């Protein structure tokens, strides 16, 4: 199927109480492979999936250098933005950056992203053409123009089309036995009876990878109504994921509701009627 | 608008403290400080991502500067030493792309501030044998016994600076190459046509800018204060 | 080091072509490369700038580059050499941080001396007070002036001179001293 590499950066200022806290993470699909935490011991980019460990010390020294340069730029950014928005030197603020490439089934470049956010709200973002910037805010107009004069987009475009996909492919090869392997959902139904008139049904999918799953309830030709309860997919802790999809039936008759489960791990979509 | 370095030249004497101004009005975030020995290598000595950001590269003394109220990126050597003798190149960066260098500061640290002397300038006149055989006439100019080697020699004909027909030594010479205080000597050459030389309406001057001591510090002793000054020698056309 | 310029010095005739060599060491695919000129003013000036994702062309001027990523080679070609190309040339590697420079190549440009006429002249005097100077001029550009073997005699390096309006150039070196034995016939004689 399709794949991606994504890095996530977080910088939280710590007014008075030391230097900002900086956290960086890397993913291939829904598997983390690297991390950095400014408040751990190593002060090094650290491995997190087995197959990345295979890279030599040039890689570790390299990625440690760059990640720290990310951090340093964020550390400056927090001082910049505190100015832009007239905020006080006391009180915490947050910078977030995220970037990465997508490839299709043929392992070729589909799309790339580089977005940035200040105190949890969009700030500046590289458009999908990878030549243009989206800047809601006034302060982000300032940033837009500076980055435009700096040809930031031109550099990011390359990375995204080159380094980002090439190495995504290298990682998919090295972690082939796990990254390219699918774990199908183990599914089951359950029936919890709210009121003597009402019954709640939750459709379960367990032990699946990747995270991409769709769970559509039905009463023969029905979908989500402001009733369908579809919770966020969650980590099982072992590298697989879990998700459930509920529906309440004031029916004394749970029929004939169907749960429908779709995943790359199933050769055919599943249909699930209720039991006894 | 541009990137700036002050002062252009400085002489201090060991143990004293000194600050090199680098300022830039191009809106640039990244700035850098390179140090250049007479052996010419460029050593990254400090840089910076933007305000609050500072990091080292190496080299004693100065190696941290500051970066708050604009950039504005001043290097500071606390307690200078002859080691610190070199060019100091400040530079600004567009994004993560090219650099824009200031002019540079030429810093000489001396063992004693009374080792500072201004240049003596003499102009030497074209030989009659040159004129006769070549139909051209070369003036030579010598600037001698100056320390530090912080000088700019320029030639002047009839009150205007010249460049055609000029050659100055790329670097000066230590007069006493066994000292650390060694005063230098610099030669230069203006070549003119025989007619032009042999024209007595024509005036020639060799001009040496010397940079040395300032108002700040500090002159007991005699021999006149070796402050920044211009020394010149001259000749007229002779037929 | 990370950027290598393995020829500290190079010399070429006027109007000719030179290729200053650069290689670098990086475990990175994204970066930018530079050439920077530093003449006797000591003012660093950008010559050319090559990003790692760019292709052929640009180029643009009388200076070109032969950039070869797999080779990690970033050659500078200077053609129709003029005397104003005399300067230090540096090669440089850059990331978000940092930019570091190679050790550098000092380039000399030897003038075309159409009609060589080597000669040593003695310059009258300066004004009734030496040191009265010796002058060696009009030799061809291949000629070697060796520095002074004796510490009371001073000799300069050679030096190109350009008479723009007469389209004429000339090499020269200067010698001076006190040694009462001092004449200009013995000065350069070595």
């Amino acid at each position: 199927g399709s794949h991606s590499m994504r890095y996530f950066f977080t910088s939280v200022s710590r007014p008075g109480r030391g230097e900002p806290r900086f956290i960086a993470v890397g993913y291939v699909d829904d598997t983390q492979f690297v991390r950095f935490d400014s408040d751990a011991a190593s002060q090094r980019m650290e491995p997190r999936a087995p197959w990345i460990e295979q890279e030599g010390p040039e890689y570790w020294d390299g990625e440690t250098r760059k990640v720290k340069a990310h951090s340093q730029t964020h550390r400056v950014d927090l001082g910049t933005l505190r100015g832009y928005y007239n905020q006080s030197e006391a009180g915490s603020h947050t910078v977030q950056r995220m970037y990465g490439c997508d490839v299709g089934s043929d392992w070729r470049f589909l799309r790339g992203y580089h977005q940035y956010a200040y105190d949890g709200k969009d700030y500046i973002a590289l458009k999908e053409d990878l030549r243009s910037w989206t800047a809601a805010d006034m302060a982000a107009q300032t940033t837009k123009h500076k980055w435009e004069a700096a040809h930031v987009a031109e550099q990011l475009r390359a990375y995204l089309e080159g380094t980002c996909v090439e190495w995504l492919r290298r990682y998919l090869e090295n972690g082939k036995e796990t990254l390219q392997r699918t774990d199908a959902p183990k599914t089951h139904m359950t029936h919890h009876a709210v009121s003597d008139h009402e019954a709640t049904l939750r459709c379960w999918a367990l032990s699946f990878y990747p995270a991409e799953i769709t769970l559509t309830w039905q009463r023969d030709g029905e979908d989500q109504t402001q009733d369908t309860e579809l919770v966020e997919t969650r980590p099982a802790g072992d590298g697989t994921f879990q998700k459930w999809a509920a529906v309440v039936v004031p029916s004394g008759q749970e029929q004939r509701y169907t749960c429908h489960v779709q995943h790359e791990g199933l050769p055919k979509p599943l249909t699930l009627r209720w039991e006894a | 608008a541009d990137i700036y370095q002050t002062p252009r030249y400085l002489v201090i004497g060991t143990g004293k403290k000194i600050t090199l101004e680098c300022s830039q009005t191009m809106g640039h975030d990244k700035m850098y400080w390179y140090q250049q020995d007479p052996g010419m290598e460029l050593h990254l000595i400090h840089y910076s991502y933007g305000v609050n950001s500072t990091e080292k590269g190496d080299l004693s003394s100065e190696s941290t500067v500051s970066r708050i109220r604009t950039e504005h990126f001043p290097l500071t050597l606390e307690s200078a030493r002859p080691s610190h003798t070199s060019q100091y190149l400040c530079a600004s960066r567009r994004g993560s792309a090219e650099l824009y260098f200031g002019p540079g500061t030429r810093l000489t640290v001396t063992e004693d501030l009374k080792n500072v002397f201004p240049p003596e300038v003499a102009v030497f006149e074209p030989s009659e044998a040159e004129i006769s055989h070549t139909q051209k006439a070369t003036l030579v100019c010598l600037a001698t016994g100056f320390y530090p080697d912080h000088v700019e020699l320029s030639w002047w004909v009839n009150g205007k600076e010249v460049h055609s027909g000029v050659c100055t030594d790329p670097q000066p010479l230590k007069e006493q190459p066994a000292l650390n205080d060694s005063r230098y000597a610099l030669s230069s050459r203006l070549r003119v046509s025989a007619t032009f030389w042999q024209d007595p309406r024509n005036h020639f001057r060799c001009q040496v800018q010397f940079y040395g001591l300032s108002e700040n510090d500090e002159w007991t002793q005699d021999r006149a204060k070796p402050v920044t000054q211009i020394v010149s020698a001259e000749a007229w056309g002779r037929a | 080091q990370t950027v290598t310029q393995s020829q500290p010095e190079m010399s070429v005739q006027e109007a000719e072509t030179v290729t200053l060599s650069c290689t670098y060491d990086t475990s990175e695919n994204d970066y930018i490369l530079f050439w920077y000129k530093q003449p006797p003013s000591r003012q660093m000036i950008l010559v050319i700038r090559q990003e790692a994702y760019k292709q052929q062309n640009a180029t643009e001027n009388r200076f070109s580059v032969n950039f070869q990523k797999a080779a990690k080679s970033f050659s500078l070609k200077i053609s129709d050499s003029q005397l104003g190309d005399a300067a230090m040339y540096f090669c440089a590697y850059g990331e978000d941080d940092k930019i570091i420079f190679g050790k550098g190549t000092r380039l000399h440009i030897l003038p075309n001396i159409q009609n060589p006429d080597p000669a040593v002249y003695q310059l009258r005097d300066s004004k009734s007070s030496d040191k009265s100077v010796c002058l060696f001029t009009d030799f061809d550009s291949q000629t070697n002036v060796s520095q002074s073997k004796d510490s009371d005699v001073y000799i300069t390096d050679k030096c190109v001179l350009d008479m723009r309006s007469m389209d004429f150039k000339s090499n020269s070196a200067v010698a001076w001293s006190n040694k009462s034995d001092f004449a200009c016939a013995n000065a350069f004689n070595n």
Partner: peptide
């Protein structure tokens, strides 16, 4: 593999 060329201060 992280970005080596392209991160700028805002």
């Amino acid at each position: 593999k992280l970005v080596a060329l392209g991160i700028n201060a805002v």
